[PDB]
Amino acid sequence: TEYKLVVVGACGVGKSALTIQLIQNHFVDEYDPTIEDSYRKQVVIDGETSLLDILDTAGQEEYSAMRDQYMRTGEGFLLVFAINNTKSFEDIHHYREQIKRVKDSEDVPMVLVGNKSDLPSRTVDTKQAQDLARSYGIPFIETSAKTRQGVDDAFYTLVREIRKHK
Ligand SMILES: *CCC(=O)N1CC(NC(=O)COc2ccc(Br)cc2C(=O)N2CC=C(c3ccccc3)C2)C1
Ligand SMILES: Nc1nc2c(ncn2[C@@H]2O[C@H](COP(=O)(O)OP(=O)(O)O)[C@@H](O)[C@H]2O)c(=O)[nH]1
Ligand SMILES: [Ca+2]
Ligand SMILES: [Ca+2]
Ligand SMILES: [Ca+2]
């Protein structure tokens, strides 16, 4: 079985860093903000293997029929913010609504990902993230692409969410 995962979130939250840690097991500090490529990876989850197709999104702050098309094939979404960036946590709501639009559906598999948990200076409290995730009916996973903490879990959890949805 194959699963199409899409990684979304505001500029600079760690979309590309998270994805490259999962795929290539290293942390990148300066990854081109315009590159929007897909990656492949077979993984074993709860005894069952899947081929993961992960679409790293980028682009400009704008509507794009082209991007809508690449994202409509997504079966699950990683909603990423950075714990030291309040604006990125506020954008989460807008990302979820855009997903609902492109998929014409309220119950798309999704996980909320609070990235950069290695950093000391957090502006977004765990409790606000937990309540937001609670209201959406989705899991919330803290991660650090730098240390690799939570990275497998973020993606593995999204796959479980997709599996349950069928
Ligand atoms: C630095 C490059 C980068 O990482 N960026 C730019 C920003 N790009 C987007 O968010 C692209 O637009 C979307 C991405 C993913 C989805 Br799902 C939907 C959309 C989209 O069409 N819109 C229009 C309104 C948007 C918005 C987002 C946040 C706050 C307010 C409005 C997203 C990430
Ligand atoms: N401390 C820390 N820095 C990160 C983490 N993830 C990404 N970064 C850095 O934050 C910046 C944004 O990363 P990037 O993945 O390019 O953001 P994107 O625009 O969402 O793809 C880069 O300089 C990364 O090296 C993390 O988990 N912890
Ligand atoms: Ca990127
Ligand atoms: Ca344009
Ligand atoms: Ca409808």
Side-chain angles (χ1 to χ4, degrees), residues 14-74:
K15 298 183 292 296
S16 296
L18 281 165
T19 301
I20 295 158
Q21 271 282 27
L22 180 81
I23 304 300
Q24 300 179 4
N25 294 86
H26 69 104
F27 174 61
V28 292
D29 263 290
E30 294 131 35
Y31 186 85
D32 193 312
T34 202
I35 297 175
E36 140 190 62
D37 215 309
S38 58
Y39 298 91
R40 204 104 58 272
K41 183 176 162 76
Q42 299 210 162
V43 298
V44 171
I45 295 161
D46 302 332
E48 266 155 33
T49 77
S50 319
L51 172 50
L52 307 192
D53 191 9
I54 304 150
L55 318 175
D56 190 12
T57 66
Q60 274 66 62
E61 262 162 330
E62 80 185 304
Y63 157 75
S64 163
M66 324 314 311
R67 189 162 295 96
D68 278 0
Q69 179 168 120
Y70 316 139
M71 299 198 296
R72 189 163 289 116
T73 57

